[PDB]
Amino acid sequence: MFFINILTLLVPILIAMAFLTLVERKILGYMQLRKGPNIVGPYGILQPFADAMKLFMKEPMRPLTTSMSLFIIAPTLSLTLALSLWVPLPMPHPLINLNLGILFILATSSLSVYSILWSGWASNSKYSLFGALRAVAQTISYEVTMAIILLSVLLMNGSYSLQTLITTQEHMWLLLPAWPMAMMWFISTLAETNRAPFDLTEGESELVSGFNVEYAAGPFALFFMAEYTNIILMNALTTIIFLGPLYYINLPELYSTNFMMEALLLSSTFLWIRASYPRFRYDQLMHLLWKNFLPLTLALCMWHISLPIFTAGVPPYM
């Protein structure tokens, strides 16, 4: 009975992300006085299928100067990690229960960067290298901050398992006590996935495309298969970690219905931000997260270390 469960978590995610591609092109277009795809289907609902079909029927290449092993293993990790990272996600019952659920996220989310590094370096191209040597700056900028924020947020939850956060927010959103962090978490999460304004690894102006200028249609889709299922995720986590929806044990179906409302609303917000602000320069991203967020995040880490101590609000374990 388990294999069937994967299908209800694997196929819908692929369909949902594919229909995010249309929703991106539509929401972006309307903010720009454009009608996104509305010719392929009734309203473009078939546009993602059209893009998917052509890329897998458009020749992928084996460039002479590249490295076949890493050039081919890098996209596989991107999709493998981006899809296997939905696994411990409670909605409200996760497919698998992990005692260290978020640490699974940190290692695996940080493991996705190696897709960009190996993809850029394997594809022996100068622009591909520039994209790789910007993910290192992208990750050195946010990883120190993203880990501390999650520590502070969970420190009023007690454990590390995700599913205890539902119990934590039974009566009040965890945004309200930690709305400072929720802003820093909403940017550090925007740094991962390389979503604008922190769109530097796949830079389309300073670099022609960025760590993709040598990935032809076939393997190229594998990066977009992963670059957008990772957008839905960190929105899925944020609505679980901060915008805690109603659990109501007798009504598990109500959690998912309310969960999707916020996850889409947050997902519409990454696309909304992309439509409004220009892009950072990757030094400013480094300074932004190391001169402004890191000071305050560390100061708030002390604040939440003492908060359960001078309020008698130490959360339980188990």
Binding site: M31, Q32, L33, R34, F130, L133, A196, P197, D199, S205, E206, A275, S276, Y277, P278, R279, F280, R281, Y282, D283, Q284
Partner: protein, 360 residues
């Protein structure tokens, strides 16, 4: 990612317009100029029109001058709109480019209505203007002008006080005032540094001496101050349109001199001398007296000048085009010192460069 040396290798768009002009009559060479700076279309041929007018020693009629100033300002708005936006497109702000191109499309209807082409209107002939404005086109220009200052504000909200835009643009491309002249800069690049210079207010060539407007000047030389100069020029150009609309004197559109400008279609088909002049002006072309001139006009990029040499013939001898971008891009080496690769991307736009004029 720090640039130690830039070597702009222009020449990828060297069509060689200057040599092709020498084999073409003066009227035949007019569309070459619409294609040099291809974002300020009819403000190029004004430079050609003024140069040929000077040698011919004729002046256009009063109505024509106002059309050439009225449409010489729509080119300024057209060209500054792209400069603000395509500059922002490379930086990353894609949205403003889509908003203001819903206004470029509106203005290109004016070209398509005064001329027949959206972009390269061969409309401003040396002998004034080719053909009169269709009825009610001034009303459409006015209805555009009212709504426009709202459009410029909407862009002004997006990318004028953002942290991301100020940090990507301030303190970048600082050009000293002494170097701006020595490098031969002109236009907004001079005014960004602080130098007070504008040919519309120092060497007037049209009714620009009867129209009031302000020339924006920047304190620091960074790309941010010259961004504001471009946005603020749209405001002042939109102020000239109000005046040109409110005083467009009646009269003829081309000089009543059938030896330089062609006669009307009606007179061509009833009077003999008019047919002869129509026949000769379109086969040999009017002959300009021998001489040499350098006329400069304040094209949106800056000082666009044309150096026409001539002999006693209908086809010019040498037509050198002072593209304002030639000096700016040559100075790109000095701008990007101790600045990253992304900054160079943000300095290509701030010069407002098109390589049709540079390479020409």
């Amino acid at each position: 990612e720090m640039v130690r040396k830039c070597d702009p290798h222009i020449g990828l768009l060297h069509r060689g317009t200057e040599k092709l002009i020498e084999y073409k009559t003066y009227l035949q060479a007019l569309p070459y100029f619409d294609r040099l700076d291809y974002v300020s279309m009819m403000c190029n041929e004004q430079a050609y029109s003024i140069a040929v007018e000077k040698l011919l020693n004729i002046q256009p009629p009063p109505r024509a001058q106002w059309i050439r100033v009225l449409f010489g300002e729509i080119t300024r708005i057209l060209n500054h709109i792209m400069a603000v936006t395509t500059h922002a497109l490379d930086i990353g702000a894609m949205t403003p480019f889509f908003w203001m191109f819903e206004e470029r499309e509106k203005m290109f209807e004016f070209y398509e209505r005064v001329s027949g082409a959206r972009m390269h209107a061969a409309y401003i002939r040396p002998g004034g203007v080719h053909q009169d404005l269709p009825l009610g086109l001034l009303d459409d220009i006015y209805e555009f002008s009212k709504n426009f200052s709202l459009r410029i504000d909407e862009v002004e909200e997006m990318l004028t006080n953002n942290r991301i835009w100020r940090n990507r643009t301030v303190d970048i491309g600082v050009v000293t005032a002494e170097d701006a002249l020595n490098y031969g800069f002109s236009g907004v690049m001079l005014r960004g540094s602080g130098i007070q210079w504008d040919l519309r207010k120092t060497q007037p060539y049209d009714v620009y001496d009867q129209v009031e407007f302000d020339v924006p000047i920047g304190s620091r030389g960074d790309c941010y101050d010259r961004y504001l100069c471009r946005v603020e020029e749209m405001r002042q150009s939109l102020r000239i349109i109000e005046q040109c609309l409110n005083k467009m004197p009646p009269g003829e559109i081309k000089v009543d001199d059938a030896k330089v400008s062609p006669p009307k279609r009606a007179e061509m088909k009833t009077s003999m001398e008019s047919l002869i002049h129509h026949f000769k002006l379109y086969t040999e072309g009017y002959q300009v007296p021998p001489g040499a001139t350098y006329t400069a006009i304040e094209a949106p990029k800056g000082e666009f000048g044309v150096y026409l040499v001539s002999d006693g013939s209908s086809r010019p001898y040498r037509c050198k085009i002072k593209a304002p971008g030639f000096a700016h891009l040559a100075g790109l080496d000095k701008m990007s010192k101790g600045h990253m690769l992304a900054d160079v991307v943000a300095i290509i736009g701030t010069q407002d460069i098109v390589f049709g004029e540079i390479d020409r």
